[model samples]
Target: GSSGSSGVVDPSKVKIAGPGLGSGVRARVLQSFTVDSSKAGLAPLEVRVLGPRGLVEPVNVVDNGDGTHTVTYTPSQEGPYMVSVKYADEEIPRSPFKVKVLPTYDAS
Candidate 1:
């Protein structure tokens, strides 16, 4: 809304979805609004999830050439997960979203 905020990532344009928003019983986290002409370069994506026991959960991303990138990650266990999404060092909406991965009702 003023100076020094020009290069900042747009929250309105940035959005996240998928099961990562809630419990990760057996699902993944989807991401968007980070890869586009507006974001182009200088806009780096960082997703670090801290699971139980200080474990660094496995996470990855998919390039669609569109503005949205499909970030996928499966929880190793049912517990609290700390999720952080950042553009370089700058934080985004729900940057530190907490996820309570519920246990699978039926084992497959």
Candidate 2:
């Protein structure tokens, strides 16, 4: 019998990924969580992303009945950004997400 500890559950197991192609410099925070709620309990979670303008907001929350959740955030600039996810009463902070402003060239 072990006590519940405060920290990230697992970095690789829980992750954030993509706005995919043509997703502009406008940053979008996409987060997904896979937790073993059966062994643990409901994976209580919240995600906040820090945008370029220094505004931190919650990413849209979606609970996928199969023990997972998703959130999406679209930011206004291309630069270093942060996404923080709190899971199982633990705060995982300041995870960086990169937004690239894809370039277009006018061929002569």
Candidate 3:
């Protein structure tokens, strides 16, 4: 879906890539997304994550300089994590997406 206009920030152009919502502990949580050149100049994109216990730390936002950005984070516990995305202090469409973290499998 489109929100506002290209001058504002196209949420549709942004994507978060990583494990599905029901991700396991052992799973390497490498979440990422890219912003188009139309909005890549919008630096300081806020990417936050709140886990079951509390807020997850060390959330990284990197600019590829080619109209793309990447976000990466690791959840210490298992439960639900809310990933919030913002641009210029405003929440982007679908800002807070919930991701459920599951327990690792014991195939022993």
Candidate 4:
């Protein structure tokens, strides 16, 4: 496990998208990110998703075999959301990517 600290996890190359700006409550907030240099054998030790109302969902990390890895999570709430990546038990800088889920409305 100590070998984990020998490598560096770069967050700059971690790109997160989806859960679009207009995503509303129960609207299926899907978020995904790609980690750089994953093909070279570097990856995160853990992935976490934090959302409003103590929401948590399954996360998937897929290696593209092309120098990058993709991680996806589904959030079920309308409020602030975050995605964090940890490598060697240490959080990558600028992790827990910030996101906001807007509440849905209806005029009945």
Per-model TM against the reference: 0.66, 0.51, 0.65, 0.61
Full-model lDDT for every candidate: 0.60, 0.49, 0.59, 0.57
TM-score of 3: 0.65
As for lDDT, the candidate ahead, 3 or 4, is 3
**Better by TM-score, candidate 3 or 2:** 3
Model 4: how far residue 68 lies from native, Å: 1.1
Q: Write the per-residue lDDT of candidate 3 for residues 1-108, one digit (tens) a residue.
A: 765644454444454455433344343445454544334335457777787668665677677776666666666655677777776566666567777765555457
Q: After superposition, how far is residue 66 of candidate 1 from its true place, in Å?
A: 1.6
For model 3, what is the C-alpha lDDT against the true structure? 0.59
Superposed by TM-score, candidate 1 places the C-alpha of residue 63 at a distance from the truth, in angstroms, of 1.8
- Clash counts per candidate, in order, are 0, 2, 0, 0
Candidate number achieving the greatest TM-score relative to the actual structure: 1
Off by over 4 Å in 1: 1-13, 27-42, 106-108
Clashing pairs in 4: none
Best by lDDT: 1
| Model 2 weakest lDDT span, ten residues long | 29-38
lDDT for each residue of candidate 1 in 2-104, tens digit (9 for 90 to 100): 5554565454344466656555444332422232323434466667788866778766866666566667667766677677777646676557777777665
TM-score of 4: 0.61
Each model's Cα RMSD: 5.6, 6.6, 5.1, 6.5
